[PDB]
């Protein structure tokens, strides 16, 4: 968890891109793994899941 | 896909020295760069 | 993938254009310089004739 | 936190050498699969990069598969060809085979030393430039002179004399001048290979937009886009327009930058700071990705055909380890020397 939160702190998205079919479960795929880290909704889901666990 | 004067073409092509004319550009990209630095000089 | 490679190349070209244009815009205009050169040439010809 | 305690004279000495290690040079194999790292102590490590990037990866896979003593003094420069690994060490260039350096033999092909002024210093070789379109190699270092060597026969053809102090870096842009060279004297010089003369000189410290007299005048890094130039080091990280020699934009950073390169549409930089600096060409700081070293001296994009899986950015500097970036926002892992 400290390594993953370190990655989240160090990536620093800093994103008007959203101004320009629903995926229900997580997509546990080896090949993607970076299109999800570039998104903010995925980070919101993981941080909310941490807060619900805590 | 979000991004941020001029010279007549024959006058530019016939007045500039061949160092700044860049006869290998006869691509539009290097052509516009040749127009820009010719306007600067 | 092919369109986004072409898009980032065009974006680099636009940034090169902006980089040259910002340096050009630290210098004064072209046509106004031609007008004041014509005026200074006429005044210099008159002063040379008087001299 | 102190996991491994050495407890022994040999292992304490090895921990002291690892603690005081500087990694100067990096080279990539003709395939993507291998990496080569030069050492402070004249050693060379060989990194199985495809084995490190594999799904099956052990903690002992981030170790040199072959490390070997190769030079008496430090290894300041490597370069790689279609078949060879050229390494400039003490004052001379050795050549190694990629097929044989993995084996137990590890013999050299040749040993070439350029002619000098016979001063009692044995000067260094800071930059190796591998020139295509003709089998050649440009040597530059503490002799303050550019030497050209044929790759087939060990004969030295051209000697170029323009700098005052020694040279840090070389460049190539495939036009009529085609060779940039930057040095400790503070001037980027252009060297036409046909006439073997100097055709243009850009003094970066003379321009008041770039000067910064506190750090001094020394040019550590150059880069070419065949029309542009990025010059950095002592004065400032500056974007020059060639054929005009005008400072277009300045990249606002305090630490001196030891290396620079062109990405697809970014500018990568590294220096006395800890992080890798990602700039936009307009002059906006896009990112700063922290590395494991206190300072970095070398970046390498591993853009090689026939191995797309070995497409990473490798960084090295004042440490005994190499940071590997599989993505440009975070480090994936680090290879111990």
Q: What is the DSSP letter of A35?
A: T
Six-digit token string for A1: 């968890």
Which member of C11, C12, C19 has the closest CB to residue D249? C19
- Cα separation, D256 vs A10, whole angstroms: 23
| Partners of D180 in the β-ladder | D190
As given in the structure block, the two tokens for residue D157 are 């053809």
CB atoms inside a 10 Å sphere around CB D119: 9
Say how far apart CA D157 and CA D258 lie, in whole Å: 30
Instruction: Tokens for D281, please give them.
Output: 């060409």
DSSP state of B25: G
What tokens does D257 get?
Answer: 């930058």
**Elucidation method:** cryo-EM
Closest by Cα among D125, D137, D141, D140 to D92:
D125
> Measured between CB atoms, does B25 come within 8 Å of chain D?
no
Q: Are D302 and D310 in contact (CB under 8 A)?
A: yes
**Coil, strand, or helix at residue A25?**
coil
Contact D330 A10 (CB under 8 A): yes
D37 - beta bridge partners?
D26, D45
- Report how far residue A38's alpha carbon sits from residue A6's, in angstroms, rounded to the nearest whole number: 15
**Short-list C19, D240, D173, C13, CA closest to B28:** C13
Residue with tokens 């279609």: D82
The answer to whether D176 contacts chain B (CB < 8 Å) is no
Helix (H) / strand (E) element for B19: namely helix B18-21
Nearest to D315 by CA among D280, D285, D273, D264: D273
Which domains, and CATH codes, for chain D? 9-336 (2.130.10.10)
Tokens found for residue D6: 């050495």
Judged by DSSP in three states, A43 sits in helix
Q: Which of D220, D117, D207 is nearest to D161 (CA)?
A: D117
> Does the distance separating the beta carbons of B1 and C30 come in below 8 Å?
no
Query: Is the Cβ–Cβ distance between B28 and C12 less than 8 Å?
Result: no
Q: For residue A37, what is the DSSP state?
A: T
Burial of A51 (C-beta count, 10 Å sphere; 0-12/13-18/19+): exposed
Residues of C with CB under 8 A from a CB of D: 8-9, 11-12, 15-16, 18-20, 22-23
Q: Rounded to whole angstroms, how far apart are CA atoms D220 and D169?
A: 6
Q: Are the C-beta atoms of D298 and D35 separated by less than 8 Å?
A: no
Chain B residues touching chain C at CB-CB below 8 Å: 1, 3-5, 29, 32-33, 36-37, 39-40
| Mutation for C interface: B11, B34, B39, most C CBs within 10 A | B39
Residue D143 to residue D119: CA distance in whole angstroms: 10
3-class secondary-structure state, position B24: helix
SS3 track for chain D: CCCCCCCCHHHHHHHHHHHCCCCCCEEECCCCCEEEEECCCCEEEEEEHHHHCCCCCCHHHCCCCEEEECCCCCCCEEEECCCEEEEECCCCEEEEEHHHHCCCCCCEEEEECCCCCCCCCCCCEEEEEEECCCCEEEEEECCCCEEEEECCCCCEEEEECCCCCCEEEECCCCCCCCCEEEECCCEEEEEECCCCEEEEEEECCCCCCCCCCCCCCCEEECCECCCEEEEEECCCEEEEECCCCEEEEEECCCCCEEEEEECCCEEEEEECCCEEEEEECCCCEEEEEECCCCCEEEEEECCCCCCCCCCCEEEEECCCEEEEECECCECCEEEEC
B23 touching D (Cβ < 8 Å): no
Cα–Cα distance for residue pair D319/D267, rounded to 1 Å? 24
Long-range contacts of D115-124 (CB under 8 A, 24+ apart): D115/D156, D116/D91, D116/D143, D117/D143, D122/D90, D122/D91, D123/D91, D123/D166, D124/D73, D124/D76, D124/D91, D124/D166
Closest CA to D265 of D288, D282, D277: D282
Cβ atoms of D179 and D163 closer than 8 Å: no
> Are D265 and C18 in contact (CB < 8 Å)?
no
Instruction: Compute the distance between CA of residue D337 and CA of residue D14 in angstroms, rounded to an integer.
Output: 12
Helix (H) or strand (E) holding B37: helix B28-40
Touch criterion met for B and D (3+ Cβ pairs within 8 Å): yes
Residue D256 phi/psi, 5-degree rounding, is -70, 145
Chains that touch A (3 or more CB pairs under 8 A): D
* Cβ pair B26, B16 in contact under 8 A: no
Residue with tokens 């252009």: D190
Residue A17 Ramachandran class (φ > 0 left, ψ -120 to 50 alpha, else beta): alpha
Chains C and A touch (3+ CB pairs under 8 A): no
CA distances in angstroms from D113 to D106, D158, D202, D308, listed in the order given: 20, 14, 30, 37
Rg of chain B (C-alpha set) = 11
Asked if D143 and D183 count as a contact pair (C-beta separation under 8 A), the reply is: no
User: What angle (nearest 5°) sits at the alpha carbon of residue D229, between those of residues D246 and D222?
Assistant: 130
Distance CA D59, CA D2 (A): 18
Which ranges of C1-51 would DSSP assign to H, the alpha helix? 2-24, 31-50
Alpha-carbon separation of residue D119 from D92, D115, D142, D143 (angstroms) = 15, 11, 11, 10
């Amino acid at each position: 968890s400290e390594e993953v939160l370190a990655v989240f702190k160090s990536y620093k998205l800093d994103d008007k891109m959203e101004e320009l079919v629903y995926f229900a479960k997580f997509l546990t795929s080896e090949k993607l793994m970076d299109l999800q880290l570039s998104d903010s909704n995925f980070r919101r889901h993981i941080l909310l899941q941490y807060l619900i666990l805590f | 896909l979000e991004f941020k004067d001029l010279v007549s073409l024959e006058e530019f092509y016939k007045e500039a020295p061949p160092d700044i004319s860049k006869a290998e550009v006869t691509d539009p990209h290097q052509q516009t760069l040749a127009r820009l630095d010719w306007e600067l000089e | 993938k092919k369109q986004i490679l072409q898009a980032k190349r065009i974006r680099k070209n636009r940034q090169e254009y902006d980089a040259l244009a910002k340096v050009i815009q630290h210098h004064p205009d072209r046509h106004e310089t031609l007008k004041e050169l014509e005026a200074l040439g006429k005044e210099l010809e008159h002063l040379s004739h008087i001299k | 936190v102190p996991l491994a305690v050495p407890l022994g004279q040999t292992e304490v000495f090895q921990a002291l050498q690892r603690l005081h290690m500087t990694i100067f040079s990096q080279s990539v194999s003709p395939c993507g699969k291998f990496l080569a790292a030069g050492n402070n102590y004249g050693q060379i490590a060989i990194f199985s990069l495809s084995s490190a990037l594999s799904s099956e990866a052990k903690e002992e896979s981030k170790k040199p598969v072959v490390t070997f003593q190769a030079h008496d003094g430090p290894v300041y420069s490597m370069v790689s060809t279609d078949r060879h690994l050229l390494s400039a060490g003490d004052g001379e260039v050795k050549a190694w085979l990629w097929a044989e350096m993995l084996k137990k033999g590890c013999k050299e092909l040749w040993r070439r030393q350029p002619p000098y002024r016979t001063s009692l210093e044995v000067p260094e070789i800071n930059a190796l430039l591998l020139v295509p379109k003709e089998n050649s190699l440009i040597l530059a270092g503490g002799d303050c002179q550019l030497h050209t060597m044929d790759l087939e026969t060990g004969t030295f053809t051209r000697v170029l004399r323009g700098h005052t102090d020694y040279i840090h870096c070389l460049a190539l842009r495939e036009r009529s001048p085609e060779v940039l060279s930057g040095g400790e004297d503070g001037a980027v010089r252009l060297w036409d290979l046909r006439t073997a003369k100097e055709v243009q000189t850009i003094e970066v410290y003379k321009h008041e937009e770039c000067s910064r007299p506190h750090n001094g005048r020394w040019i550590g890094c150059l880069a070419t886009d065949s029309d542009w130039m990025v010059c950095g080091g002592g004065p400032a990280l500056t974007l020059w327009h060639l054929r005009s020699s005008t400072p277009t934009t300045i990249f606002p950073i305090r630490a001196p930058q030891k290396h620079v390169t062109f990405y697809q549409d970014l500018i990568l930089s590294a220096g006395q700071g800890r992080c890798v600096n990602q700039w936009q060409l307009s002059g906006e700081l896009k990112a700063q990705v922290p590395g494991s070293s206190p300072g970095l001296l070398s970046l390498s994009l591993n853009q090689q055909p026939a191995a797309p899986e070995c497409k990473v950015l490798t960084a090295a500097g004042n440490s005994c380890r190499v940071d590997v970036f599989t993505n440009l926002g975070y480090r994936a892992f680090s290879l111990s020397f």
